[PDB]
Amino acid sequence: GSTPDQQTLLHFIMDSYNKQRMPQEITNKILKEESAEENFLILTEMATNHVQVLVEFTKKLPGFQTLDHEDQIALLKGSAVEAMFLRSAEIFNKLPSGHSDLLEERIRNSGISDEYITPMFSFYKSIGELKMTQEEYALLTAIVILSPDRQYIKDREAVEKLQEPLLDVLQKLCKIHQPENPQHFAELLGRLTELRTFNHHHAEMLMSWRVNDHKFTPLLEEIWDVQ
């Protein structure tokens, strides 16, 4: 059973999570537009848009705004790519504005390595197989965003105090909405680490793209520190 002081948290987070959707104008390009250059450019347009979503979400995460201004940036930079993996996963696993088939085909043909694309979809399947709830997507995202063990975090203790309550709620739901299998809570947290493997790759990939004269936006150059 969930407490009323926990109950306020979940509603707040689910409310924050639902309070931002991706513009049709951007997602319409998955349908309408033509090339490997185009497919890449579209993905870039959604990456940029999702950084803003993430920021607006993160601001509404309870207790975030009190954190050290220099820690707040570190938490966003270190978590961006991961949150984007989850959002895509949610879309492909659940969507009307997703266009699963088209979008997948565009991703596949963007001049991006299979070394990276192959595991990406292996991940999407597996996280879809978990038959994950919109609460479980929304809470895991916050948890990821507020991961204390990011690089360049000054005051790691202060993050843990914000993260742990969100884990404690999640463990409650894994027993409530998933009583048969108790390992369900630990299946969710296995992702947190698999999602971390994709960070490591992403920096290597990012270089690959840069040297191929790939152009990115001022917000993505900032979030990933492109010179």
Partner: peptide
Amino acid sequence: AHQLLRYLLDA
């Protein structure tokens, strides 16, 4: 450094 994320965090 990081003018934009700040701007977005303070809007």
